[PDB]
Amino acid sequence: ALDPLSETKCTLKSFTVEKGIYQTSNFRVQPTESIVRFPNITNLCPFGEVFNATRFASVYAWNRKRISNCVADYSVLYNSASFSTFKCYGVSPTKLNDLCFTNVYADSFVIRGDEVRQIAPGQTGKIADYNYKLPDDFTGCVIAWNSNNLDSKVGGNYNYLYRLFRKSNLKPFERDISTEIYQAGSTPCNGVEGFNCYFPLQSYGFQPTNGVGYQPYRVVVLSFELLHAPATVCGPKKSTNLVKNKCVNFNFNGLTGTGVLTESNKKFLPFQQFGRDIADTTDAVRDPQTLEILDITPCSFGGVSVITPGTNTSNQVAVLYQDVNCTTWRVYSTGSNVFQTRAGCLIGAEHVNNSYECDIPIGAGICASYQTSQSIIAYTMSLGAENSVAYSNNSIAIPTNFTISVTTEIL
Amino acid sequence: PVSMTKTSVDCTMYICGDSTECSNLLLQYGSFCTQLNRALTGIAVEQDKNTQEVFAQVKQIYKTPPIKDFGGFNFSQILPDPSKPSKRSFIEDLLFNKVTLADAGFIKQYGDCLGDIAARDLICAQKFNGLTVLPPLLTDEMIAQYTSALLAGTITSGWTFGAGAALQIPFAMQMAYRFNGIGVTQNVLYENQKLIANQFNSAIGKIQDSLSSTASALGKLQDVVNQNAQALNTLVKQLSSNFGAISSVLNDILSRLDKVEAEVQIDRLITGRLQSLQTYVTQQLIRAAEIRASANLAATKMSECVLGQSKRVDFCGKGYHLMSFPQSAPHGVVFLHVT
Amino acid sequence: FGAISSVLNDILSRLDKVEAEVQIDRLITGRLQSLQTYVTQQLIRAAEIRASANLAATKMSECVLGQSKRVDFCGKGYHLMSFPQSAPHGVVFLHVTYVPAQEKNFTTAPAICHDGKAHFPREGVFVSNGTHWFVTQRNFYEPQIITTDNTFVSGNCDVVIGIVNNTVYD
Amino acid sequence: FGAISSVLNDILSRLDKVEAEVQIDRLITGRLQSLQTYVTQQLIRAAE
Amino acid sequence: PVSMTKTSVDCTMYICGDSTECSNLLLQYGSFCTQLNRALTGIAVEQD
Ligand SMILES: *[C@@H]1O[C@H](CO)[C@@H](O[C@@H]2O[C@H](CO)[C@@H](O)[C@H](O)[C@H]2NC(C)=O)[C@H](O)[C@H]1NC(C)=O
Ligand SMILES: *[C@@H]1O[C@H](CO)[C@@H](O[C@@H]2O[C@H](CO)[C@@H](O)[C@H](O)[C@H]2NC(C)=O)[C@H](O)[C@H]1NC(C)=O
Ligand SMILES: *[C@@H]1O[C@H](CO)[C@@H](O[C@@H]2O[C@H](CO)[C@@H](O)[C@H](O)[C@H]2NC(C)=O)[C@H](O)[C@H]1NC(C)=O
Ligand SMILES: CCCCC/C=C\C/C=C\CCCCCCCC(=O)O
């Protein structure tokens, strides 16, 4: 990265470059600053209402609570909350602080210690089949912690129930609270329990002296979407000012990227937050604070070529920026010699008004040559000698001699 | 068709865009990008090589005689006119008009593509995704000058300038020699000189009318242009493929996943985009071989139909070949075969 | 190719069968892709080489085994002969051609009116040295006296454009 | 192609959506590569 | 030789057969099948 000549050396994987013109990497523009744009939310998320709740629901009647307009600063749980299980599926845990979550729902219930493993997208068992099923494409985090000190009674806590004997497996995120008598045998029930007719709900024991597999465990499943919709729950990240018309790193509602932000004429619908082009790249975004639409443009643009006479001859190089007037410019280095041929700005080469045979083809009728104080000279290549045939309606040219010519053709 | 569009690919920009993590992961491949760029550079060099073989056969620029007294034959229609800013013939102007290039020029500044135009302009998207189009070494004016030199040599000297040392000859005597070549006694040329000149002028006018009408008849060059544009646009469009990853956007993966978890997704995306680039380069190589065959045929025809009178049947038109006239066209040559 | 290492030995040394299976599969896929790319490039280059060899065989048939009348097919100029020479992975054709050297201006005429009839050379061109008219071959200046053996008569003199008057001398 | 089986039916019969997704992706990539190789060879033979 | 056999490929049928899950997963690729079919169609037209 010292200079385009060194980049050519690295691309060719050699310390010597022969005479010619070599394409290098496109003109890169590095971001200058980093900006974060989150909606202004000050209220902390109801961590106390969820993880500190006095009473939890039964697994067959698991509770669902909406989470909206709050800051997901889970570090407040570090002081008092200890979790035996914390597994995130659609998102890495270390990124949870840099993201905004779209549709946050907390599903709370109480199960056995041995059944916590069943809270997963593709598990089987009593809880996963008849009580609570996660979707295969579940995005969110499952949290579970032992609650023996709270949900266990010396005589036995029988207030927590689970569904046994269901006809078919539950759909993902489906709740069944019916208490109809289950018919196990061929004899049909009439609302009475007996023989092959069982009540579908059974209570846990939950005694303090129970084993760790039979101790109560409180489970909260947080489900959300990421980087597709407006979103109103965000991490503890402080927003900065909005910088436009400049190559910056940006964090819009958890979506990170690099580019130039400009005012956009697109009119987003109220339910839309991001705009995407044919390549699925995010090319437009609604500002979470000013509610304005901004177009995002890649910083890097334009082809670059290096013209060299050969490292064995000289270390002088010329640079061709194929998408620029030499009308600051999008040039790595500019000085003295600018010509502005077709096929881009040429920097580091002298220009002459004469025409010669092509030596290094720059393109668009322009060629380069290392010529005399030696220097790189850019010129318009000559098509050949110019003359006139002495045409007349009564004049002929007839050879009075001949030449025996022998030429070589290599195939 | 003589030449096709010269293209270059910045593989780091296409596969990874502006992502540093993706670039670091792509560094493990390295040589495949160099191989693709070497193949593309070979194709780009071969394009100018084909153009040079087709049009630079003579290295001696003969420009038009002023008198233009060719025994009733009218060549002011395929000869260049100084009134036009480009010294190209009127028929060459028609051929230029009937072929629409993907872009007007080869320089598109950042300001032009800055904003919402990037998402609507195909060239802007191609350039933002690391795909560049290289201009030909020979401009259209230079190819027109070569065609004019060939035409002047054919009109004033006939077949002699193809063997070096252009010897002037009256055009009626040249036509008589060609008539003798096709097996007709030269007096038939002289006893029907007015009729033959009128028929040639009428045929040139018929070509006039055919090219100036709504009928294109130049689909071979437009097909090459459309094929190159379609290949580039397909390369741009294929960036939306997930390739088995959770997303087709590197930014989303990097935003929602840590280094270890995002590494596999970025590897899948890199493999898919490298496969897309390899497929594009292979198709470009095959099309370049076809274009090279076409350009070799065009060079052979210019040598044998323009620089001389060919006795091969149906090689320089239908009928007994008398002469041929070259005309430049976008990415090709048009041969007017007088038979 | 996305694996932890590019060396199979390291993967087999630090990983068991199950864990090393995915890395070896990645390496196998990458190396198979490399081989496929090499073979495709070889096929394209072989097609190009086959076209070149077909052209070389055609030139040997038409420039060495005979005299070609195709312009610029067996060298620049009027082809006389060609000689093949072997070369590493190729053939070199020495094309002996005929090139005019010293052109001279002459006054020419499409036809000559002798006795109310138009005469034509039937093999060359009429030329003049200021006073008298001769007939010569086109590719070499060898003027000869215009007789009835090197000319043929066709029609009258009022139809040919550019006809001149000359008296045939015995 | 690195998958547990070359038959989609076996994978779908013994694996759920998430587990079978990676195997089906491997099979899709391999078969797409096979089709691409066939088409490239056909293009070369068509040029000849 | 003048012409060769003109062929067409149903990429969904080759890669996935009659599997709906495989077809849904293959929908993420999309353009590669169209590219292969376009090349094959070009070859088939060139034969005639
Ligand atoms: C959703 O409800 C439908 C209808 O109540 C259930 O389908 C019934 O399933 C039972 C046995 O599971 C059959 O005896 C009935 O004939 C079915 N009826 C119909 C209309 O299909 C379905 O099983 C329920 N789904 C879940 C996940 O509980
Ligand atoms: C050669 O052809 C051109 C046509 O391309 C002739 O120019 C035309 O001349 C007539 C009258 O003489 C005008 O009505 C037309 O408008 C002209 N067409 C043009 C300029 O494109 C030209 O006269 C012909 N040469 C000779 C010697 O007759
Ligand atoms: C040979 O063909 C030419 C052209 O096809 C004939 O010339 C035309 O004759 C018609 C009469 O039949 C005239 O109306 C046209 O004006 C002529 N054209 C030209 C350019 O002069 C010719 O008559 C035919 N026959 C002979 C013996 O030459
Ligand atoms: C009150 C509901 C808040 C909803 C927040 C939504 C998304 C943010 C994500 C995860 C927050 C819960 C983390 C619990 C474990 C913390 C780490 C530990 O102690 O091991």
Ligand SMILES: *[C@@H]1O[C@H](CO)[C@@H](O)[C@H](O)[C@H]1NC(C)=O
């Ligand atoms: C939960 O409750 C305990 C005891 O009441 C308290 O110490 C702790 O701070 C609470 N945590 C939260 C997050 O509210």
Ligand SMILES: *[C@@H]1O[C@H](CO)[C@@H](O)[C@H](O)[C@H]1NC(C)=O
């Ligand atoms: C907070 O965001 C709202 C958008 O809901 C915006 O109207 C308001 O100006 C913002 N306030 C500040 C201080 O940025």
Ligand SMILES: *[C@@H]1O[C@H](CO)[C@@H](O)[C@H](O)[C@H]1NC(C)=O
């Ligand atoms: C650069 O911009 C100017 C406008 O001032 C334009 O005339 C010129 O054509 C542009 N450069 C090229 C190579 O066309």
Ligand SMILES: *[C@@H]1O[C@H](CO)[C@@H](O)[C@H](O)[C@H]1NC(C)=O
């Ligand atoms: C013939 O005469 C012209 C001028 O009338 C001259 O330019 C040309 O060189 C002459 N040709 C030869 C061979 O001397």
Ligand SMILES: *[C@@H]1O[C@H](CO)[C@@H](O)[C@H](O)[C@H]1NC(C)=O
């Ligand atoms: C023309 O040629 C004839 C015979 O070759 C000769 O007698 C005569 O003097 C010549 N005239 C001129 C002007 O050269």
Ligand SMILES: *[C@@H]1O[C@H](CO)[C@@H](O)[C@H](O)[C@H]1NC(C)=O
């Ligand atoms: C050449 O043209 C002139 C016109 O000035 C004419 O006088 C002369 O006869 C013509 N000669 C021939 C051989 O055509």
Ligand SMILES: *[C@@H]1O[C@H](CO)[C@@H](O)[C@H](O)[C@H]1NC(C)=O
């Ligand atoms: C040739 O002779 C004819 C017939 O006498 C005459 O009409 C014509 O003018 C003569 N040509 C010259 C150039 O003297």
Ligand SMILES: NC(=O)c1cc(I)cc(I)c1I
């Ligand atoms: N071949 C060339 O390009 C060239 C040759 C000479 I001698 C002088 C100069 I200035 C140049 I720019």
